[PDB]
Chains A and B, each alone.
Chain A
Amino acid sequence: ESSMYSPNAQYYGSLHNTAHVMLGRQGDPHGKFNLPPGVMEHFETATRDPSFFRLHKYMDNIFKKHTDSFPPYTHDDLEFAGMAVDGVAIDGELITFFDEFQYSLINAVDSGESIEDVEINARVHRLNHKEFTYKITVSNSIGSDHLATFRIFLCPIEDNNGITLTLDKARWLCIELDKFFQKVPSGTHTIHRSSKDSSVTVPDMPSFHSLKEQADNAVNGGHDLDLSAYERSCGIPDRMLLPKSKPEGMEFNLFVAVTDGVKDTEGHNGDHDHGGTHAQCGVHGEAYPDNRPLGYPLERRIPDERVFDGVPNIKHVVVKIVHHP
């Protein structure tokens, strides 16, 4: 990155952070023009720049050489004994669209001494999607109910040239859609999971105006302020859960891995509240609740798809996403 956890910054330096600055300053690399830092030199702005993603794919491939170095998982590595994913389905169509969102620009303008404010807003078009529900039918043939981790990814089927991807060629392109822990009772049952409850996403933030209104009303009235329903600001926006896709529709693989929750959450309790954004943002003030490597079970090479196809607790199905322009 590097962080202050680095055991040896004198030798390994700070590749990623220095690269942000190197790229950010390429419009004035020697300081001759008195230009300020580039958008790459702020986390507020860095993803605006196309080169952000070329830099971060470069970095991602460094990590990938490490994750590719381990032995591929075996059947016995992956099998959650007695747990079968019988079916994966979605209630509701997968549809994306653009809608409108407003925020205030008042803090950006200069206020006169004893002249009144005026409302000044920006209106942006943002991606969004309709709500839907996963229906994951699992058969628990162990003699008792068992905690399970449900891991949900969206994976490409074909590339931009229309070439069908192998699982090994798809896995590093998959995007995480959800991760949750749930007790699976003995027998066959369909687990229902709302898109709105994804542990990858969080809602749009409440406005400054709304926070002022609520705090002022509580302080002025002597009432307690309860903002506990508000989620953290770390997490993919709910509205961006799905890729835009195309008006004509695109097909993707919806990948579901159901893994041993007692093992995955050992030491972190499978009954405890892990918040709304634990997949990538962790749990505020707590250890990370999933002991598995980030990306499990897609983070190792899969040279032989037969291994995954023979694991009953893994299943993928084709879904279609349509963009409504």
Chain B
Amino acid sequence: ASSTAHKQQDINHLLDKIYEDTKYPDLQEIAKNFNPLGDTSMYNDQGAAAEVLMKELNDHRLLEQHHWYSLFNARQREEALMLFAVLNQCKVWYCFRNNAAYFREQMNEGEFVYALYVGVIHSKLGDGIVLPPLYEITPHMFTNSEVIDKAYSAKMTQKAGTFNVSFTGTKKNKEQRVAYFGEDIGMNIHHVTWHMDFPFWWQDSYGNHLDRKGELFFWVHHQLTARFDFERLSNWLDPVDELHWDRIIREGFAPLTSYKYGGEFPVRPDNIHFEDVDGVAHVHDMEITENRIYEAIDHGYITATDGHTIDIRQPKGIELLGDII
């Protein structure tokens, strides 16, 4: 039951038709009858993570199904990580599979998919599993709205079809010349998977340290930026400018993409100044934060909570900067 074949099959089934109740009777039975609190010896933490999540569920404090999910939303992330924490404590596959089946039917689908992916990646139980490409598990997040609408039409008419995607914007938009870079479905999987492998929410109490993570954070994004500029150079364009909090964002964007639940992704006009975002930050807060990071760089040390100096004039300095940035 812990064989790679069965674990892979289990994961395939859990991720199938993710917006609907599971169509697999064996997963249905588990979701109905399994008790995450029913055997604390299943877990390396004596059952604590399961208690934490079940209390949120039983108190009706979890995000509803059929709702957008953003990893950058603090509360939604906290909920996804409560399920990750349970999966991460399972000693044996049946604990992992049964909790995943149980919470698939109780939790928001975006949170569930996120937690299951990082759970597989960061548990030794996940070794050998190949995660399906997210562009087939949640295609809305990788497919423009026009093609999704054709897929909806194919389903409404019960007729199979294959539909061509053809990049956002018009030829009048010079930025479209390089749309094949950032819209490539594999480039997007690269990016999501890097962050799943090296999550900003990681704590070593989850089981292990992620070596040089802050420096790898700098490097992977430096390479994304440098690779994009090489596409611009290939297409008779100048390099990208850098963002400034007090200057206009020249290039707007119309995603022409939609959530499965939540509506169309919002458009940004050309040539707009940053505005304060209610519930997030003031633009001035971003400037102050930037200033404080540059203060550390130019001091050669990061300032600890009690004021003492943390030396960054050494090879680990770039990593510590990644940690704080």
Using a CB–CB cutoff of 8 Å, the interface residues on chain A facing chain B are: 10-11
Residue of B nearest to A9 (CB): B298
Which chain A residues border B298 with CB–CB below 8 Å?
A: 10-11
The interface on chain B, measured as residues whose beta carbon lies within 8 A of the other chain's beta carbons, has a size of: 3
4 CB < 8 A contacts A-B: A10-B298, A10-B300, A11-B298, A11-B299
Which chain B residues border A11 with CB–CB below 8 Å?
A: 298-299
Q: How far is the CA of A11 from the CA of B309 in the complex (A)?
A: 15
Which chain A residues border B299 with CB–CB below 8 Å?
A: 11
Interface string of B294-313 (1 = CB under 8 A from A): 00001110000000000000
Which chain A residues border B300 with CB–CB below 8 Å?
A: 10
Using a CB–CB cutoff of 8 Å, the interface residues on chain B facing chain A are: 298-300
Least Cβ–Cβ distance between A148 and chain B, in angstroms: 47
Residue of A nearest to B297 (CB): A10
Least Cβ–Cβ distance between B311 and chain A, in angstroms: 14
Q: How far is the CA of A300 from the CA of B10 in the complex (A)?
A: 81
Least Cβ–Cβ distance between A11 and chain B, in angstroms: 5
Q: How far is the CA of A10 from the CA of B300 in the complex (A)?
A: 9
Q: How far is the CA of A83 from the CA of B298 in the complex (A)?
A: 52
Q: How far is the CA of A216 from the CA of B300 in the complex (A)?
A: 58
Q: How far is the CA of A10 from the CA of B298 in the complex (A)?
A: 6
Least Cβ–Cβ distance between A31 and chain B, in angstroms: 15
Q: How far is the CA of A11 from the CA of B300 in the complex (A)?
A: 9
Q: How far is the CA of A10 from the CA of B295 in the complex (A)?
A: 10
Which chain B residues border A10 with CB–CB below 8 Å?
A: 298, 300
Residue of B nearest to A12 (CB): B298
Least Cβ–Cβ distance between B86 and chain A, in angstroms: 47
Least Cβ–Cβ distance between B250 and chain A, in angstroms: 16
Residue of A nearest to B313 (CB): A10
Q: How far is the CA of A10 from the CA of B296 in the complex (A)?
A: 11
Q: How far is the CA of A11 from the CA of B295 in the complex (A)?
A: 8
Least Cβ–Cβ distance between A117 and chain B, in angstroms: 52
Q: How far is the CA of A182 from the CA of B298 in the complex (A)?
A: 49
Q: How far is the CA of A11 from the CA of B298 in the complex (A)?
A: 5
Least Cβ–Cβ distance between A8 and chain B, in angstroms: 9
Least Cβ–Cβ distance between B310 and chain A, in angstroms: 16
Q: How far is the CA of A11 from the CA of B313 in the complex (A)?
A: 13
Residue of B nearest to A11 (CB): B298
A-B complex: 3 closest residue pairs judged by Cβ atoms: A11-B298, A10-B298, A11-B299
Q: How far is the CA of A106 from the CA of B310 in the complex (A)?
A: 62
Least Cβ–Cβ distance between B10 and chain A, in angstroms: 56
